[PDB]
Structure formats: structure tokens, C-alpha cells
Structure 1
Amino acid sequence: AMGSMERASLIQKAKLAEQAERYEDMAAFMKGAVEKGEELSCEERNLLSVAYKNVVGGQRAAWRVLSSIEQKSNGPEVREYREKVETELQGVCDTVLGLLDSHLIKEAGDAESRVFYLKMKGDYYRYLAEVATGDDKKRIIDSARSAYQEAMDISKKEMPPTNPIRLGLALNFSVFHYEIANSPEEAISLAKTTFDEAMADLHTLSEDSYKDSTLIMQLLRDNLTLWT
């Protein structure tokens, strides 16, 4: 429904929606921007990520509330409503994965862009995995793993160890290991090696880049504290 709006107007309205904390509108404006077919700039990639992370973040928090109530109960209403929220969440994940597959990833040739979109692919498969069960859960877990792994391979070859997207990728792949793949040792090892390699590279950074990197290193630290 955004096909008649100018790309630049969609981007401007995404930024306005962000200011107004209207994340569903923001995601719809950024979906329309992507569907114009042009590659996204660094700023525009961040708008896309913020919009959907806020939308899906709300759905995940709601799904968790409903799942807890449902598990305690174990009428059809709690299950029915958890399933409705779950379906809506899956639809948002499938929408984001669709944008990545058509055709953000294939056109992304620079390390910054390709790693950013593959991290997103890992994250949205991870969200699908959280609500999945059975073997269904297995192929979804492997899709999240594969995307994270390709992103990690490129980030290690192409980016310094303090690059914020490299750090955030490692952070989320470590959460995948801990929370999804039942590999807490792999999670802890990855977060520790990532933290230590970034610490050794901080001396190369300006004040502002130091601020950006140490913020994400603190997130790695917070997880290690929680997990150990």
C-alpha cells in the first residue's frame, strides 16, 4: 500500500514514526522503501532494523506472557489467543525474511551491508525458532545457524574486532547458542573471545568509536555475568 509514495517520503515518514514511537507504521514505511528496489544506506538499514525489532519485540514479550499463563493452565481461550499472537509474530518474521531474500542480501556486496542483513536473517529465524516445536524447530534452528555463521565468516575476514555490527552479530549468535541451540559453552566461549579481541583493538579507536564499541562489549559482559 506504499507503492504510490516516493522513496524519500517513506524514509522521512519512517523517521517521524520513530520519533512518535509508532513502530508498526515505521516498519510499514521501511518495507515500502525496501520494495522500491534500490539498495539501503547505512542509516536506512538501521531504520529498517529498529522498526522491525520493536514490532517483533512487542510480539515476543506478549507471546511469553501468554505462554506462561498457558503452561500454568496445564477452556481453549489462552491457547487460542497465544496461537493468534504467535501467528502474527510468524507473519512479521516471514515479512522481514522475505525482504532480505527479495532482494536485499543478494544485492549487498559490501561487508557492512552483507553482515548486517545476514545478522537480521539469523535473528528473525531465531525468533521463529522460539515459538517452533519439533523437527519443525530443527530446520528453523539450522536456518538461523547458517545465516549467523555466514555473517560471522565475513565479519572475521572483513571487519575489525571492534566493529559494532561485528560485535552485535557475535552477541546475538552467542544468545542463539545459549537460548536456542542448548550450547551454553559455545555461547560463553564466543562471548568471551569476542570481548577479549575487541578489548585488544580499542586502542585504535577515536573517542566516539570507543563509546560505540564499549557499549556492545558491556552487553557481552552482561551476558557472561548472567551465564556464569
Structure 2
Amino acid sequence: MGSMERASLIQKAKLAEQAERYEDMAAFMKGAVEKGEELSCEERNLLSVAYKNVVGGQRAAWRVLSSIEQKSNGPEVREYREKVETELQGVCDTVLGLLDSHLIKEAGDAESRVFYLKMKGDYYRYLAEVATGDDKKRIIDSARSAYQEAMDISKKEMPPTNPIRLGLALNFSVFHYEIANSPEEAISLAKTTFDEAMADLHTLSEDSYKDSTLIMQLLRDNLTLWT
């Protein structure tokens, strides 16, 4: 996308979202990141939405194929699961590469840095979902370390109702439950996050209240499933 203007890439990312063309969306936003400028709040959301949808479809397909493969145990199901897996890993590596070159290092404000570190934890988590053995351990630790740094910044720099702080805590709790085999840590984190947000709702306008309570309901939904 090197020959397209940054503003045109952003505009086309928005059109691609409206058209539900998420692969195109992600390609436009990769091009925008590669222009080398920092991303605004809205532009960070476009980057995240694009890749979440792309990798979300890959993850759903991988789970379908992995389930069929487990039931079977010719080479076709394994071969095709491996093909989808390699594609998924490539998307995760692409996102991680954008974060490392150079989104995180240029992000000084807490909101941007936390947003990118949450992404980093998420894409290492998606790598961990398909990893095996003694590559899986290092991938898990990379996810944990990214989430932990984001958590440390968010607790110092953002109110407990901030939607990025809340979503980070939600996703880190999912990491603890599903990846790290730490369901008690997952439940603790979700409970403390929910309670501290509850106690800060009084400070919020109606619109901020709506966003924060929506994520708090997702924390509660997990707590209900886990307890």
C-alpha cells in the first residue's frame, strides 16, 4: 500500500468495515501503520477491529478442524488444520511485527501504550492457543509479560472504569483461565476489576457509563460461567 496516501488508506479501512471486508480492512490499516506516523485513538480501533475479525475467523476455523481431527484420532484433516494454523500464525506474526516496528516504542501516552500492549498480549495468546510443548511455554510467557506491563501502566494511569483498562483485565482473565491454567487468578482478577469499576461509575457521564457497564457485564458473564 506504499503508493496510497495515509488518509486514503484510513478512509478505505472505514469503507471496508462497512462492507464487512475485514481482510481488506486489515491490509489498509497495515499500510497506514507502515507510513510511520503514530495512530490516533480512532485509527487504533480500526487496526484492532480489522485484525480481530481476520484472526477470529481463522481461530473459529481452526477449532472446527481441530475438533474433527481429534475425533479421527488419511492425512487430509491434519494437513488442512495445519494449513489454517500456519495462516493464523502468519497473521499473528504480522500484527506483532507492526507492534514491534514501531507502534509500541513510539507510544508514550498511557492510553496508546496500554492499547498496544493489550494487543500484544492478545496475539501471543492466539499463538498460544495453537502452540504445543516447549515453544508453547515461551509464547505463554510473552503473552503474560505484555498483559502484565499493560496492567501495571493502566492501574497507575487510568481510572478503573476506562474501557481499555477494563477490556485488558477481561482479556488477561481469559488468558489466566484458558491458557495459563490459573482459573483462581482469572476469577480473582475479574472480581476485583468488576468491583473497582462499580465503585467508580458515579464519576461517569451517561455515555461513559454505558461503555463501562457493557464491559463489566462481560466480566460478570465470565464469572457466572466460571463459578
Calculate the TM-score normalised by the size of structure 1: 0.99
Give the equivalent residue in structure 2 for 1:145. 144
- Distance (whole Å) between structure 2 residues aligned to residue 224 and residue 65 of structure 1: 26
Give the equivalent residue in structure 2 for 1:197. 196
Offset of residue 145 of structure 1: 0.1
Matched position secondary structure for 1:177: helix
Aligned 1:154-193 pairs, distance under 5 A: 154-193=153-192
RMSD of aligned Cα (Å) = 0.2
- Distance (whole Å) between structure 1 residues aligned to residue 18 and residue 166 of structure 2: 26
Offset of residue 99 of structure 1: 0.0
Give the equivalent residue in structure 1 for 2:31. 32
Residues 26-79 of structure 1, C-alpha deviation per residue, up to 9 Å, x if partnerless?
A: 000000000000000000000000000000000000000000000000000000
- Distance (whole Å) between structure 1 residues aligned to residue 196 and residue 186 of structure 2: 16
Percent identity over the alignment is 100
- Tell me, which stretches of 5 or more residues in structure 2 are unaligned? none
- Distance (whole Å) between structure 2 residues aligned to residue 82 and residue 153 of structure 1: 37
- Distance (whole Å) between structure 2 residues aligned to residue 226 and residue 25 of structure 1: 35
- Distance (whole Å) between structure 2 residues aligned to residue 47 and residue 102 of structure 1: 18
Offset of residue 86 of structure 1: 0.1
- Tell me, which stretches of 5 or more residues in structure 1 are unaligned? none
Aligned 1:17-56 pairs, distance under 5 A: 17-56=16-55
- Distance (whole Å) between structure 1 residues aligned to residue 60 and residue 96 of structure 2: 20
Matched position secondary structure for 1:157: helix
Offset of residue 80 of structure 1: 0.1
Give the equivalent residue in structure 2 for 1:120. 119
Residues 116-164 of structure 1, C-alpha deviation per residue, up to 9 Å, x if partnerless?
A: 0000000000000000000110000000000000000000000000000
Matched position secondary structure for 1:39: coil
Offset of residue 94 of structure 1: 0.1
- Distance (whole Å) between structure 2 residues aligned to residue 215 and residue 24 of structure 1: 27
Residues 160-183 of structure 1, C-alpha deviation per residue, up to 9 Å, x if partnerless?
A: 000000000000000000000000
Matched position secondary structure for 2:159: coil
**Are residues 1:93 and 2:101 paired?**
no
- Paired residue total: 227
Offset of residue 220 of structure 1: 0.2
Offset of residue 212 of structure 1: 0.5
- Distance (whole Å) between structure 1 residues aligned to residue 24 and residue 41 of structure 2: 20
